[PDB]
């Protein structure tokens, strides 16, 4: 933007740079259409054009090679989903000139034969390639919508907020009483529709008129406003049917111990406690590594189906190092010791959601990752660990304390090239 | 802040 950005290019051109395919990111624009692309397709590139072959696809980046070049000398990388690239036949339909690049002019007086020879029975870009890209490029939200958003100052409560900015499906949410707020993706589990808090039984901070509106929607009927962000705009991993129609999938009871990603420190998985069971599978969790203080205040809401909660012992079995409970010791800490101390009970494996999606991520893969500690930053990152469904992502050239445990389907992770597509500043390794 | 502007 106004300040510049990091470019992947110096890294792109080495045979050790492995990038997560766009296919890995269900929220990424062009995710579906992308696996129709192939590492051999021909394409029209460059007021005049030429055909080139895609030799290599890394994230959104494609290695182009012009026709009639003996060597890789003039191979060039493009952002496939936003370069001046078209499917073979584009020029002919529009009357645009196909002129050989200066370096190879001499090869022929006339070029139709050569090209026809190269283009016959050759693949190009999927049917409606760029339309599909542009459709997914749009936000479900629009500027000026009010929603209920986790209060960054009091994580045990949501606070009325407003969509103020949108850059590539990432929203800025400004709180009602404030010029403070945060960035988060459209799909993130910490933003909610108006009425959510009083539906679920979660704590709410909002204006008087709004507090009255929600109360007068639960004693009687929901009054919907023109600027309400409503349920249809939000991603949910379940439906309300499951709770009111079929027998409730509810299983956690208050007091059950478990393990959870620390919402205040994504590099940490800790013992936690179910502190209040809300409606529709939502529950208030307390991370036990905190100083005994969170009395209502620092409790956090995870839905029972969240891929950030795990049975006790999860770290142990998976060779993840656990953050021990407050007053305990990493060399010493044992669940069986902790439970006998606290006289508490641990939630059984059967209570947790255990589906391992076919995510395709693997150790060493490069990707772009939002910094949840500062979500205006999207940064160069690597898949440091893949534990079934769960990823440890490391920010290249930062320490390990900045690492983030994220779900493989997190909306905070993006294919290399996302930033330039969406037009967002990209942070490279620090120097 | 912990991350300085870059
Ligand atoms: O996992 C959410 C992810 O799915 C996409 C993929 O096309 O869209 C689906 O999910 C949305 C969230 O519930 C729905 O609103 C949408 O209608 C559905 O196609 C992405 O948009 C989204 O990032
Ligand atoms: O702007 C992020 C900012 O919010 C804090 C509040 O302490 O954490 C909240 O927001 C984060 C991303 O928006 C999430 O990591 C977190 O779950 C939520 O509680 C800060 O840690 C961070 O600086």
Which DSSP string do the residues of A128-149 spell out, in sequence order? THHHHHHHHTS-SS-TT-EEEE
User: Tokens 């290399």 — which residue?
Assistant: A416
As given in the structure block, the two tokens for residue A254 are 């208050």
Closest alpha carbon to A184 in A237, A141, A225: A141
In A166-281, where does DSSP find H-type helix? Answer: 196-200, 208-215, 241-244
Closest alpha carbon to A66 in A82, A81, A48, A92: A48
Q: Is A92 helix (H, G, I), strand (E, B) or coil?
A: helix
- Strand order of the sheet with strand A42-45? A76-79, A61-66, A50-58, A42-45, A86-87
First to last CA, chain A: 20
Nearest residue (by CA) to ligand 1, atom 22, is: A27
As given in the structure block, the two tokens for residue A410 are 């997190």
Using a CB cutoff of 8 Å and minimum separation of 24, what contacts does A10-13 make? Answer: A11/A366, A12/A58, A12/A61, A12/A63, A12/A77, A13/A77
Closest alpha carbon to A281 in A254, A250, A260, A309: A250
Topology at the third CATH level for domain A245-356? SH3 type barrels. (2.30.30)
In A48-137, where does DSSP find H-type helix? Answer: 90-94, 112-119, 129-136
What is the chain A residue with the closest CA to B1? A374
Q: Is A185 helix (H, G, I), strand (E, B) or coil?
A: strand
Q: State how far the alpha carbon of A307 is from the alpha carbons of A118, A160, A352, in Å.
A: 49, 26, 9
Tell me how far apart the alpha carbons of residues A133 and A30 are, in angstroms, rounded to a whole number: 5
What lines the ligand 1 site, CB under 6 Å? A 26-27, 140, 187, 235
- For A293, counting Cβ atoms within 10 Å of its Cβ (0-12 exposed, 13-18 middle, 19+ buried), the class is exposed
- CATH assignment of A1-136? 2.30.30.140
- Experimental technique, in short, is X-ray
Contacts of A371 (CB under 8 A, 6+ apart): A377, A378, A379, A395, A402, A427, B3
Nearest ligand, CA A233: 1
A137-244 carries CATH number 1.10.10.10: no
Closest alpha carbon to A324 in A292, A289, A290, A286: A289
Nearest residue (by CA) to ligand 2, atom 17, is: A263
What is the chain B residue with the closest CA to A430? B6
Ligand 2 pocket, A391 CB below 6 A? no
Tell me how far apart the alpha carbons of residues A359 and A368 are, in angstroms, rounded to a whole number: 16
Tell me how far apart the alpha carbons of residues A192 and A160 are, in angstroms, rounded to a whole number: 10
Q: Contact A356/A389 with Cβ under 8 angstroms?
A: yes
Closest alpha carbon to A31 in A59, A72, A2: A59
Ligand 2 pocket, A263 CB below 6 A? yes
As given in the structure block, the two tokens for residue A141 are 């939200």
How many CB atoms are located within 10 Å of the residue A334 CB? 13
Tell me how far apart the alpha carbons of residues A409 and A126 are, in angstroms, rounded to a whole number: 25
Cα of A110 from ligand 2 centre, angstroms:
62
- For A320, counting Cβ atoms within 10 Å of its Cβ (0-12 exposed, 13-18 middle, 19+ buried), the class is middle
Ligand 2 pocket, A395 CB below 6 A? no
Closest alpha carbon to A48 in A4, A10, A98, A104: A98
Q: State how far the alpha carbon of A302 is from the alpha carbons of A89, A282, A307, A323, in Å.
A: 51, 6, 9, 19
Domain with CATH 2.30.30.140 in chain A: 1-136, 137-244, 245-356, 357-431
As given in the structure block, the two tokens for residue A215 are 């109360």
Q: How many beta-carbon contacts under 8 Å exist across A and B?
A: 8
DSSP per position, A342-364: HT--BPPGGGS----------TT
Nearest residue (by CA) to ligand 1, atom 13, is: A235
- Gap from B6 CA to chain A (nearest CA, Å): 8
Largest CA distance in chain A: 88
User: Tokens 């529950």 — which residue?
Assistant: A283
Q: Which CATH class is domain A357-431?
A: mainly beta
Chain A residues with CB within 8 Å of chain B CB: 371, 373-374, 377, 427, 430
Cα of A308 from ligand 2 centre, angstroms:
16
Helical (H) or strand (E) element with A65: strand A61-66
User: Tokens 């990823």 — which residue?
Assistant: A391
- For A148, counting Cβ atoms within 10 Å of its Cβ (0-12 exposed, 13-18 middle, 19+ buried), the class is buried
């Amino acid at each position: 933007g106004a300040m510049g950005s990091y470019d992947w290019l110096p890294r792109l051109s080495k045979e050790n740079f492995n990038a997560a395919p766009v296919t890995c990111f269900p929220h990424a624009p062009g995710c579906e259409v992308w696996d129709n692309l192939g590492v051999g397709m021909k394409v029209e590139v460059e007021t005049s054009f030429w055909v080139a072959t895609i030799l290599e696809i890394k994230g959104y980046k494609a290695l182009m090679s012009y026709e009639g070049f003996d060597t890789d000398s003039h191979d060039f990388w493009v952002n496939l989903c936003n370069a001046e690239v078209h499917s073979v036949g584009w020029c002919a339909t529009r009357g645009k000139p196909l002129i050989p690049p200066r370096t190879i002019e001499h090869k022929y007086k006339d070029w139709k034969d050569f090209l026809v020879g190269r283009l016959s029975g050759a693949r190009t870009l999927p049917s409606n390639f760029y339309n599909k890209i542009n459709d997914s490029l749009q936000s479900r939200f629009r500027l000026g919508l009010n929603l209920e958003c986790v209060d960054k100052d009091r994580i045990s409560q949501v606070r009325l907020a407003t969509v103020t900015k949108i850059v590539g499906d990432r929203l800025f949410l400004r709180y009602f009483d404030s010029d403070d707020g945060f960035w988060c993706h459209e799909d993130s589990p910490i933003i909610h529709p108006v009425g959510w808090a009083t539906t679920v039984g979660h704590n709410l901070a909002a204006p008087q008129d709004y507090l009255e509106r929600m109360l007068a929607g639960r004693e009687a009927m929901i009054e919907v406003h023109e600027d309400d962000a409503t349920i249809e705009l939000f991603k949910m991993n379940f439906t309300f049917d499951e709770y009111y129609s079929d027998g409730k999938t509810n299983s956690f009871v208050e007091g059950m111990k478990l393990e959870a990603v620390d919402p205040l420190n994504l590099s940490s998985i800790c013992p936690a406690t179910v502190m209040a069971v809300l409606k529709f599978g939502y529950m208030m969790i307390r991370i036990d590594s905190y100083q005994p203080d969170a009395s209502g205040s620092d409790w956090f809401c995870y839905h029972e189906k969240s891929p950030c909660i795990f049975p006790a012992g999860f770290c142990s079995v998976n060779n993840i190092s656990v953050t021990p409970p407050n007053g305990y010791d990493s060399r010493t800490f044992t669940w069986e010791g902790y439970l006998s101390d606290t006289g508490a009970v641990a939630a059984g494996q059967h209570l947790f959601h255990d589906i391992i999606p076919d995510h395709g991520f693997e150790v060493g893969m490069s990707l772009e990752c939002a910094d949840l500690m500062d979500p205006r930053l999207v940064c160069v990152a690597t898949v440091a660990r893949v534990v079934g469904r769960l990823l440890k992502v490391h920010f290249d050239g930062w320490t390990d304390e900045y690492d983030q445990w994220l779900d493989c389907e997190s909306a905070d992770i993006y294919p290399v090239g996302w930033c330039v597509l969406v037009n967002h500043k990209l942070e490279g390794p620090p120097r | 802040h912990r991350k300085v502007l870059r």
